Amino acid sequence: VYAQEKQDFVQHFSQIVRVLTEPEIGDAIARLKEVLEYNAIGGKYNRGLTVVVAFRELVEPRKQDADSLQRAWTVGWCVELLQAFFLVADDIMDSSLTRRGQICWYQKPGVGLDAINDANLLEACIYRLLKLYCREQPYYLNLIELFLQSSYQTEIGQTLDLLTAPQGNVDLVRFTEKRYKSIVKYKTAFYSFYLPIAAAMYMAGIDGEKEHANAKKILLEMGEFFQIQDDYLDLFGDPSVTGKIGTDIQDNKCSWLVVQCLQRATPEQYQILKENYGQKEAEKVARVKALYEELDLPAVFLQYEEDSYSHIMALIEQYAAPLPPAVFLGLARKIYK
Amino acid sequence: VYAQEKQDFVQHFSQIVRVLTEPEIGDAIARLKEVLEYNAIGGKYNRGLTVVVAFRELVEPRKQDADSLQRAWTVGWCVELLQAFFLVADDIMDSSLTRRGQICWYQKPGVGLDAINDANLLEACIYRLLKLYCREQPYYLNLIELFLQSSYQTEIGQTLDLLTAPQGNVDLVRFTEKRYKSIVKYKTAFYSFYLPIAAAMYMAGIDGEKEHANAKKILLEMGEFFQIQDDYLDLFGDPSVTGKIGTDIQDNKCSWLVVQCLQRATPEQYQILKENYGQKEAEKVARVKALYEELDLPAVFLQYEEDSYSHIMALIEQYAAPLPPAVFLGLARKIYK
Numbered sequence: 305v306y307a308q309e310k311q312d313f314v315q316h317f318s319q320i321v322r323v324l325t326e327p328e329i330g331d332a333i334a335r336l337k338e339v340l341e342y343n344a345i346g347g348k349y350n351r352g353l354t355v356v357v358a359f360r361e362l363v364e365p366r367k368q369d370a371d372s373l374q375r376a377w378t379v380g381w382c383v384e385l386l387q388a389f390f391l392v393a394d395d396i397m398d399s400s401l402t403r404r405g406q407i408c409w410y411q412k413p414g415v416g417l418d419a420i421n422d423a424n425l426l427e428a429c430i431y432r433l434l435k436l437y438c439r440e441q442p443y444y445l446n447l448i449e450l451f452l453q454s455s456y457q458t459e460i461g462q463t464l465d466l467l468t469a470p471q472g473n474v475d476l477v478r479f480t481e482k483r484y485k486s487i488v489k490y491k492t493a494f495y496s497f498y499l500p501i502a503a504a505m506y507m508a509g510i511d512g513e514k515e516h517a518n519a520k521k522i523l524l525e526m527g528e529f530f531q532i533q534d535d536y537l538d539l540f541g542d543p544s545v546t547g548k549i550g551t552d553i554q555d556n557k558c559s560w561l562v563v564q565c566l567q568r569a570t571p572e573q574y575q576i577l578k579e580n581y582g583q584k585e586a587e588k589v590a591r592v593k594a595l596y597e598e599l600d601l602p603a604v605f606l607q608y609e610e611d612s613y614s615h616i617m618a619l620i621e622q623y624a625a626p627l628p629p630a631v632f633l634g635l636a637r638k639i640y641k
Numbered sequence: 642v643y644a645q646e647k648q649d650f651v652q653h654f655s656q657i658v659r660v661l662t663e664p665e666i667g668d669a670i671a672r673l674k675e676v677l678e679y680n681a682i683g684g685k686y687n688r689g690l691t692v693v694v695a696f697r698e699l700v701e702p703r704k705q706d707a708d709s710l711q712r713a714w715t716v717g718w719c720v721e722l723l724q725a726f727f728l729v730a731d732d733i734m735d736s737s738l739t740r741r742g743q744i745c746w747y748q749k750p751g752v753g754l755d756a757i758n759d760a761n762l763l764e765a766c767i768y769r770l771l772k773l774y775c776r777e778q779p780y781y782l783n784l785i786e787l788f789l790q791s792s793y794q795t796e797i798g799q800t801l802d803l804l805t806a807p808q809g810n811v812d813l814v815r816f817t818e819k820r821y822k823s824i825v826k827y828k829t830a831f832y833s834f835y836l837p838i839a840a841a842m843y844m845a846g847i848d849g850e851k852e853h854a855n856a857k858k859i860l861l862e863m864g865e866f867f868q869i870q871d872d873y874l875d876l877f878g879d880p881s882v883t884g885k886i887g888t889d890i891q892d893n894k895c896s897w898l899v900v901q902c903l904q905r906a907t908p909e910q911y912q913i914l915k916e917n918y919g920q921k922e923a924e925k926v927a928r929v930k931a932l933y934e935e936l937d938l939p940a941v942f943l944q945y946e947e948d949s950y951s952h953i954m955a956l957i958e959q960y961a962a963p964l965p966p967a968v969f970l971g972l973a974r975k976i977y978k
């Protein structure tokens with residue numbers, strides 16, 4: 305329901321940094337603090353908040369002691385660190401300029417490609433926090449394996465993203481709905497909303513294969529919507545709101561936009577896209593955006609967001625039980641705002 | 642004792658690739674195969690072999706069935722994948738040219754910074770293999786935590802390496818034996834020879850804190866020698882033998898060589914080093930190498946290798962028991978060849 309819930313979560317960031325950043329390695333620990341502060345804050349915090357809210361909804365308060373509550377927000381901060389690790393690396397590989405309303409970490413003079421190792425440290429912080437706070441719990445190994453498998457799935461999706469988007473090479477024939485759906489399932493659906501709810505389910509003692517699979521049915525589809533919205537906003541969103549500049553056209557990406565464009569384009573329009581996509585020149589990028597506008601892709605996206613919301617609601621009705629519907633409804637509220 | 646042991650280990654690489662590389666993600670799995678083939682072979686295989694040899698030495702043959710033996714070489718291949726993950730990233734961050742007798746993976750036209758994700762996939766492969774082959778064993782969680790902690794320690798050391806070696810900035814005052822020893826302990830000693838023997842000890846059921854600490858006393862010192870030898874060879878080794886071109890001078894690194902140089906340099910020689918270190922120009926690099934030769938650093942290294950070997954032998958006498966000395970002696974043989 306709340307942004308009070310969100311402020312409560314964000315208030316724990318200082319404690320997470322503190323415990324991660326306690327003589328010889330001192331200079332390295334300070335750099336770690338600097339990487340956490342720059343890269344783990346400044347977004348919307350929904351993924352990590354979801355662990356806290358879901359956990360509360362799945363466990364009776366007569367079991368939610370101070371230590372249990374702390375484990376929940378710590379694991380929520382683990383999901384945030386996973387996102388941070390991945391975005392630092394992604395921004396390098398995507399040649400991005402800005403993120404979360406500031407220059408990308410690797411663009412800072414003085415950082416550069418050393419951000420590669422800085423990302424690897426954020427990943428390590430997840431397993432440090434799990435050891436510090438969850439090691440005696442019955443779900444500990446489940447949580448470790450969930451984070452590891454989520455990361456491997458995300459990495460497979462990144463591979464697909466990058467292979468389908470070669471620099472210097474036309475790849476329009478590969479830009480199909482079928483390829484699109486596989487890319488986004490792996491690169492986004494597992495780690496965005498499946499991961500945090502699955503984590504909360506484990507923490508609540510819900511470890512059954514069937515209940516995880518039913519939750520997955522809902523949550524992967526939510527994640528696939530989230531990536532389509534991300535692709536729309538790359539070009540049509542306001543960077544003062546999104547906090548980042550889009551690069552998909554210049555990067556030759558298999559975006560939902562280019563897929564939808566190809567589905568509707570005349571042969572003449574196909575040649576316009578072929579001659580202008582996947583190139584650094586601003587005039588060429590502008591020609592693609594004009595094509596997308598001519599083809600009313602912003603309206604196609606509006607219709608898709610309506611159709612998607614209805615579908616996800618129907619999946620909640622099919623697959624939520626025996627979990628409280630509100631577990632999924634509050635996520636849907638935030639995602640489809 | 643053997644290179645027959647080594648050939649037996651290397652023969653299992655095809656099986657490791659096969660099991661990692663079994664429809665939608667097909668193109669990504671093929672890229673994975675390509676990354677494994679290019680980056681996980683072509684070195685000396687001592688780290689991974691060590692798991693196999695140590696395991697054999699610590700477990701009675703009446704317990705070494707076909708499945709036990711397979712787990713051992715699989716975990717040895719995990720140590721090799723850890724090395725591969727780290728070297729792919731290191732070569733980017735160090736601006737390296739060649740590795741293992743070929744162009745660095747990220748230097749390949751067509752690869753570039755996409756190697757960032759390729760490295761992250763090699764890391765993931767370690768935990769995939771652990772799950773596939775060790776998940777029902779009593780040491781499984783121990784092995785997972787050992788690989789995770791080793792990786793975090795290595796990453797802290799990489800941080801220190803990179804902070805002490807800023808581009809464009811003189812950092813001679815920081816190049817002290819005390820800083821040197823901290824850098825190499827973290828960036829190399831944990832993951833090179835501690836990790837494989839600790840893994841074999843866990844697999845053998847040797848999980849005691851004291852026995853691990855005693856093994857660590859020997860193995861971290863072996864690793865610190867190995868890094869000093871690596872630093873010597875960066876400049877004095879034959880790339881036809883080492884399989885890589887050195888970059889430490891141009892990269893402004895806190896190498897053992899520059900540390901030893903600073904200890905012996907006159908004020909005049911300090912200014913020569915200050916004016917020439919940490920810069921891309923070949924003529925400047927040549928001036929540093931001439932200084933090191935004038936100061937007889939190759940002889941200082943020869944004397945150090947003798948002194949170090951004797952010290953490591955004395956630590957074997959102090960700390961090996963109750964493990965067979967041969968566990969450490971065979972490592973020392975290979976390292977100090």
Ligand SMILES: O=P(O)(O)C(F)(Cc1cnc2ccccn12)P(=O)(O)O
Nearest residue numbers: 390391394398458462491492534538
């Ligand atoms: O627009 P962003 O945030 O850069 C993006 F959504 C970031 C992103 C989505 N899924 C992943 C997975 C790993 C790393 C970054 N990811 P992308 O458009 O690059 O695909």
Ligand SMILES: O=P(O)(O)C(F)(Cc1cnc2ccccn12)P(=O)(O)O
Nearest residue numbers: 727728731735795799828829871875
């Ligand atoms: O000479 P190499 O192999 O590049 C080196 F030994 C590689 C290396 C040693 N320790 C690590 C740890 C992580 C990654 C690479 N490592 P470096 O001289 O860069 O320090």
Ligand SMILES: [Mg+2]
Nearest residue numbers: 394395398400
């Ligand atoms: Mg991106």
Ligand SMILES: [Mg+2]
Nearest residue numbers: 394395398465
């Ligand atoms: Mg991307």
Ligand SMILES: [Mg+2]
Nearest residue numbers: 534535538552
């Ligand atoms: Mg995007």
Ligand SMILES: [Mg+2]
Nearest residue numbers: 731732735737
């Ligand atoms: Mg290097």
Ligand SMILES: [Mg+2]
Nearest residue numbers: 731732735802
């Ligand atoms: Mg290095």
Ligand SMILES: [Mg+2]
Nearest residue numbers: 871872875889
């Ligand atoms: Mg070196």
